[model samples]
Target: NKYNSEILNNIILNLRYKDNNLIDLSGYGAKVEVYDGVELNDKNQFKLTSSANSKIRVTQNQNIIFNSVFLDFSVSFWIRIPKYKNDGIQNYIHNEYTIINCMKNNSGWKISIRGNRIIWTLIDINGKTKSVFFEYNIREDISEYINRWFFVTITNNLNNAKIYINGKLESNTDIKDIREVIANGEIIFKLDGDIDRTQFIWMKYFSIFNTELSQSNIEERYKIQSYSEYLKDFWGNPLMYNKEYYMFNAGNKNSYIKLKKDSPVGEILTRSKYNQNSKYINYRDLYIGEKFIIRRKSNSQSINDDIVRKEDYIYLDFFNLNQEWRVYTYKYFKKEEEKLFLAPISDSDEFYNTIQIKEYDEQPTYSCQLLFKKDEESTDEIGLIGIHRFYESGIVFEEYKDYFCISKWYLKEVKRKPYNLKLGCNWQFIPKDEGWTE
Candidate 1:
């Protein structure tokens, strides 16, 4: 529920080489020029040859606007310095070669290579500059990435700026004095030509996001390695994605799940009377838009295993807790707004077929309640049932004590109008009247 498609809508520039030209895929018709000595190889890669003046330039258009003082932007690319050599870690180059140079009314941003390091400089509206340098002297830094296809991303949200290599945070800093400015000149790439022992490099892809992308966004792109692999919604436009949900135990006969506005990954905090304290655990690997059955395992085995009918102990029901638990996912419509409702279930058989919360335009918070039924007879006290089991029964009940199995979980994607649904206290449930003992 923490995924948002509107973030992709903020894309200002997306350059991909096709039909002998660098095409702007962001629907912005921005023209790109390929200068002398730049070639597109048979492998569909932009080959930058070492020449006196080899470069590619992206002409300015309406989409390249950065006039806002509260700008949030990011630039990503895949590049390889095939013949790169490290003269020395401390060696500074007098002849700085630009890989990307974006200028706007005397103040702009540029990425360049100075000797063995990569430098990103942001020229403030006043023409003053703030720069972050990536100079690795360790084995895990940029040293081992030479001559290999590496992904580099630079993000600046006016107040904070960060540089990432291979989806890892290389460096970041805070800045406050920079004012608002616009990028008016053509975004140029001095791809080729050597300077102070640094050689030309090969570029496969280049993209720019007007919004500052999160670490998960960069990691997703690096893992896929292709612009085509970006997560897309049903309409085929770029969208943020998520695949898991968690049910955490929040103690005092309660459980909870958390979904951040900037994160798709979620955590569950479980606490029962036995443990009296709640802690967090990661949950995932469930299919979206499908019906799943939830049943309790008698043997207390791995939660990832298949549901066994013979060992079914207790299953989850929506109205099983002190408060109703329901899953919610939403799509944004700029105009009309509507909601959906579902048929109430009668027995546990109907509980097996669970509805899946699918991805939509806007991020929606989803809450699912868990209920357990005892399958075997037990005389054990509720305090000893151990409801805090991580992979065991997701939740334990005082009435049933020890014998409850949760299995056969199903989730589906469907649209239903809402009725009598209240967004209430369940959003923040805690133990009442008494403090939880650790």
Candidate 2:
């Protein structure tokens, strides 16, 4: 609901053919077609392969990427350029297929696929031009990626310009960047065909964000896009804004708050007061990186439920491991949650407050100290509440008192920011304020 409107991906201009606001969206033709290796196997989707030389032209003076400074930007999409045919046939185009072109005629950027690589050429506002390419972008042969869905992301952060192939940094250039908006002008694109180098280019999820993206950030996006299958039944297209309430958590100094507006205590500003709500975060809506405040479980929720280390969460002695799960260390929790929660990759990405932490070497190294306020119940313990985890046991509440300890979990506040990740393989937990900075 209440999310930062300026955060990356939060506010974006989507060029998806199905979802758009353009005059020529209905090009020279229309038909439903499928390729061999598209990401999601849905014969329901389709791409354009028009005729009559009427390219995708945007003649109306409108905002494409953005109407702001337009300095730093990121464009992400999934595209599969059909294989070029050198068949001994005449009257067929023998050149590259333009994926996107022209920001005001000749003063922007043009991306196209030629041979086995993606070529990007930019002509800045000063009319200066420079080009960069991802050589052999589809491995060794054109067939390797022909009609094969692949992700291509182009990002520029003033200082550096880079391109990511399938979420990995493939190439970059030191040439000039798109310093400013090239003025509101017509935008053009041409990628219609039927083989002999005149083949169609299937594209999906085409979006442009006004933000700088790192390698890890790109990988995170690509990763989520790959495995982020879920219930898109929510009110707007949930898949597009799967970010669910872009980080706007609240807490005192060092509170390490990260939450969404849909959460109970998310209606106010950060580092402020709390409000009692009749609603709580539904179990089905919980996602990785979500934060929640836990209080002793009660018939009716209240701040009096502040749980200290003396109490423990209780689960059945016999448990069912139906849903997939693994501990961070002892496979208990994190070597650190800040280090182990790599969504879908380590099941931990799906929030697991119920945990058991154990290690032969570091007996108590993987623990964090949580500071809870003195509740109305008047706790005798004055120091920080220690969250201890122990694992590999059938059932034991006697030890490891601080856990999914019986409590009402209200969504905590969060601040919108890019993911904390390493090399795209692992991600740092959001509540890192209680753990190591790394």
Candidate 3:
């Protein structure tokens, strides 16, 4: 939810087409139809050909990679095309950006690019007509269909081209001549049907992007166009806010004082809190970053429960993990209803009183020091430090013991800012008798 980003597909054109915003095309005299939220495919892909030298074109406005020499790129999609065609007609029209169209000679699939005035093509001999792969450090495309929507995608760096269809690769080609390469290239979708429309094709959930999207991210994006509920972050990277959070210097004299709404904590503001009921304590019990999650004890259905309602407030923490100790307590409730306890990532302790200490090499070190306090009555400074390895760690806990409560996890890589390590990876278990594996 809350994912409001623009897609880089060419035919999106910014506004709705006079025709049903959902319909792609009705007749050729009209601008070749295109859709954003949907796509063409096996059940309904368009038929295209280059007859009498006439061609259909679908133009897109996308960021172009120009003047870069060593660029890295990749592209892919699924497709289903008819099995017959003219052996001498070009199936695609393209410039610098790659094209995954069919070859003029009925080649299984051609992954090609035009940079130094040459067209490079790679073919898949597997005998399958869908979900092919075409990889190039530069760029290329793969497929030709009539009345059938075949997933098609092409991507590449400055010197290579790679393309894929239906989630599988069809070919891999290399271009040895790097010099004289004009980095700028145009992507134009054109048909070579020789002035006659021979087939009709359809596609759904179609997607096109400039960046080399990962397979997982691509798969996820293709699943659906929208969700029932959306979510966003405070500033909105999740929400897209450009401002930055400020963290106090660790050496400040008031380091032990609990943080206040008016006081500054780490890069985050002291007033910031975690989204309640957000399944904060997911998998893996270890903590490592600046934030933590506070889960409501089950059976807690009273005013206190109302107080913890996710919408009511943001939870924060005030404790450090480096101390090798944990303290948990439950505020008394109706005597008949036994009080509940905080659930750990896994089974840490039956009672919320004890926690486990993960000791591996440098043991992916984790610790929490004190953040300033709110008032004199509160003795324990509020804060927590959990060190682990991930991208979602942060200090986000609220309710503490009757004395004071605060906890959070810090994934080594998720901290506000960390000193750089030469290692490509971060957070590793220090073996008792073995060296770190590269």
Candidate 4:
């Protein structure tokens, strides 16, 4: 019901002439007749071989009547021309040769081919006495396209007209004052059997549409494999104009967000205010180069959700397999400051956190005094210094309830590698916001 107006492909007639007669594929029951020596080839194309008298006609149908039927229309086909038989210019007709003719009461139009162009003539009658004509020319090198299948299309969008050849727009003309009347008589193809050097012509895929199609749509149809492929993006409700954002989820992965009208931004990560699960979270705005802290409840029964430290050493178990993930080390005081620490790549355990503090045989070594925010709910403990190891089978505790205040880290660089690791992939990081200091 709501999609009625958006419908396309109302074919008035589609002629392949495979049946050796003008069989109407549109099911309108319009009577057609082939006169003289027109023949259907083995490839189902219409071939004109003998004389100029050979023609095809569709009997006078009211559906083709301009004023009574359609305000917009289109005609498209594929044609192949053969090589020249002679070198004489006088053998070819200098005037227009009719390709298609649809006229009634001396007021219809005609499409013809000249030496190197396709011409369209519009005839309008007034009170059965006066006649007016508007002519349009579509420039094409007919000789260059010989023996090759070339697509041709002509369209009238009520206010304007256009011609396209091989999916490219060739000519567009304004038909503002042109009064297009439906042909009350027969539609005829007055094809020339021997125009230049007694040539044979091959024509196929003649189609008529009552609705005018856009240029992009015509190009898409010409380039695609079939009609269904051209209509792949046409399903679902029409896009709303006022809607600012285009939401996408796991189920609908192809959806996008529009920053402005007709301006689409790439995929983004979004989250809702309430939902914590990755699948259930509603999305919020996110941009590249922006920094934010991830707050999630830790699952550990050993310690309450609190920040505590020991030996002025704080350990963190950041689990990532990517080589590009960089971690900035710093010392903790009244205010957070930057300090170099022993940071190395190590293979952590599969179950719990691991932090190994190996001596460099240097002047002195310091332990990371990790902190936490003490709360009723349990929080997972951070890593330990000096070759620390823990498992689900064994663990320990601390002195008083200390809170953990983690200085924020910046997602500095994200360079994707080819392979994926066990936990994740490649990433680099650096601390931000009062992270580095003396």
Q: What tens digits encode model 1's per-residue C-alpha lDDT throughout 68-110?
A: 3328888888776532222322333344667788876777788
lDDT by residue for model 3 (148-256), tens: 2334545544344545443334444453333222211222233322222442222233333335554445444333321111111211111111111111212121111
Taken over the whole model, the C-alpha lDDT of each candidate is 0.46, 0.38, 0.27, 0.41
Q: Give the per-residue lDDT of model 4 (tens digit) for 1-438.
A: 655323236677777554556677677666878776777654446766546556788875665423553478887776654422223323432544667777776776677665445666566554122212222221211122434446677877656678887677877777766775555558887564336435555677777787787777677556541221100101111111111111222212222222222311111222323223322112222112212111112333443223221211223332222221112223232322111232233333212212211211111111112223122233332221111111223345433211111221111111123211111111111222111111
Off by over 4 Å in 3: 4-78, 85-150, 158-160, 179-187, 193-208, 225-438
- Highest lDDT: which candidate? 1
Cα RMSD to native, each candidate? 18.2, 18.6, 20.2, 25.6
Looking at model 3, residue 196 earns an lDDT score of 23
In angstroms, give how far residue 113 of model 4 lies from its true place: 1.2
Whole-structure CA lDDT of model 4: 0.41
Report the Cα lDDT for residue 336, model 3.
21
Instruction: Count clashes in each candidate, considering only residues at least 3 apart in sequence or on different chains.
Output: 35, 19, 115, 38
lDDT head-to-head 3 vs 4, winner: 4
Q: For candidate 2, write residues 1-438 as lDDT tens digits.
A: 544222244324544333222222223222222222222223112344544343455443465665523577777777655433323213233345566675774477778765566877767667787666775432221122344456788887665668888778878888654455453455455553333433555566655666767777777666655432221111111111112121211111112222223321111122322122212100111122233222232232433322222133211111012332122211222222122221111333333323211111111111112222232254421222111122435465443211211111110101112321111111111221211111
